[PDB]
Amino acid sequence: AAAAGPQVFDVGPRYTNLSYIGEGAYGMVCSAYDNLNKVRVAIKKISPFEHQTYCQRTLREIKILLRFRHENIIGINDIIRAPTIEQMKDVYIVQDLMETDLYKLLKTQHLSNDHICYFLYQILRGLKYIHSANVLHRDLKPSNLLLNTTCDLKICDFGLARVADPDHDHTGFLTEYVAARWYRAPEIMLNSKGYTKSIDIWSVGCILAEMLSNRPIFPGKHYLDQLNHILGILGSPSQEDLNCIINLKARNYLLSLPHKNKVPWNRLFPNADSKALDLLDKMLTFNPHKRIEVEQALAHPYLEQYYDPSDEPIAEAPFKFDMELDDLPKEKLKELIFEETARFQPG
Numbered sequence: 001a002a003a004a005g006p007q008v009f010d011v012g013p014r015y016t017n018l019s020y021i022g023e024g025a026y027g028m029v030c031s032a033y034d035n036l037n038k039v040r041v042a043i044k045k046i047s048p049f050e051h052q053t054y055c056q057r058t059l060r061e062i063k064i065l066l067r068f069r070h071e072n073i074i075g076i077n078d079i080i081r082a083p084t085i086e087q088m089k090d091v092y093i094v095q096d097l098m099e100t101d102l103y104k105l106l107k108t109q110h111l112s113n114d115h116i117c118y119f120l121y122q123i124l125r126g127l128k129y130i131h132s133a134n135v136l137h138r139d140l141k142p143s144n145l146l147l148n149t150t151c152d153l154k155i156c157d158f159g160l161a162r163v164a165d166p167d168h169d170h171t172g173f174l175t176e177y178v179a180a181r182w183y184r185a186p187e188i189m190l191n192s193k194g195y196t197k198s199i200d201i202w203s204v205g206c207i208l209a210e211m212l213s214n215r216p217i218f219p220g221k222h223y224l225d226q227l228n229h230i231l232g233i234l235g236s237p238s239q240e241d242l243n244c245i246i247n248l249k250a251r252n253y254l255l256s257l258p259h260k261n262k263v264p265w266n267r268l269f270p271n272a273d274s275k276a277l278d279l280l281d282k283m284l285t286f287n288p289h290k291r292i293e294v295e296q297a298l299a300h301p302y303l304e305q306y307y308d309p310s311d312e313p314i315a316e317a318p319f320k321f322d323m324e325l326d327d328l329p330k331e332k333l334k335e336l337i338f339e340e341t342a343r344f345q346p347g
Contacts, residue, residue, distance in 0.1 A: 055333030072126030205283025
């Protein structure tokens with residue numbers, strides 16, 4: 001039983017020279033030498049079967065990532081688990097080794113306008129595929145964007161992902177949310193469950209702004225502070241935009257706030273390409289109805305060096321129906337995880 005910061009990191013025959021590369025979700029991550037493909041790889045140990053919540057996120061992510069096949073979405077190369085449900089306590093997920101992520105890179109590295117353009121292009125190319133599969137990522141943030149040494153970008157972490165459900169998106173004011181505060185669309189704090197594609201475009205807009213300055217654009221300390229940060233830059237919502245918020249607690253909260261004028265993007269980002277700020281403006285639109293769609297963003301002039309819709313594939317097999325994991329008991333979720341991982345068994 002090969003050990004790492006001894007705990008058990010027991011990874012097949014084929015995965016050797018374990019080097020600890022931090023902590024993940026329900027276990028730890030280590031790089032290793034894939035003795036078959038003769039390439040170094042990332043292996044995540046997942047230990048979720050105790051907690052119903054851990055089981056749902058683990059299954060959701062595995063079902064999505066095995067169905068997706070796209071250059072800008074992290075793939076599962078392999079899954080190591082016991083041959084029986086009884087012996088299965090841990091799952092190991094093998095993925096392409098990505099040396100860094102955009103969080104780590106933004107902490108220390110200035111991005112050129114060309115890198116910002118290329119990274120955004122790749123984010124939106126992967127997001128087009130995701131949305132075309134009727135899936136929302138719901139937790140896009142720099143740490144969920146993996147990069148290698150040749151600047152290939154892959155979206156990861158579909159733990160909070162859901163099938164899109166715009167018909168059922170409405171909710172009351174101050175409804176609890178799980179996804180990273182700083183990347184939350186304004187509507188999440190007002191009247192949205194985050195079941196529409198527009199919530200992911202907002203997150204990408206936030207990431208673009210963070211790429212332009214190396215600092216999060218809306219670093220809210222609390223749930224309503226998130227809103228204050230947003231309205232500090234976009235200014236008070238228009239009457240028309242308020243008219244779309246029929247929820248009285250949310251509308252009267254917004255009406256209670258002092259009037260704020262829009263801060264021009266060119267004032268926050270004086271060194272930024274004007275086309276990037278044009279596209280940022282359209283991604284960070286208050287009204288989710290007026291917010292640019294992924295395919296429109298790809299067609300924006302900022303991305304004209306890369307834009308090729310024939311080379312921006314969509315999903316063959318969208319998740320047409322809700323994945324009803326909400327109140328399956330753990331034991332059902334462990335069996336589905338077992339069944340979902342079966343294709344990787346010599347067995």
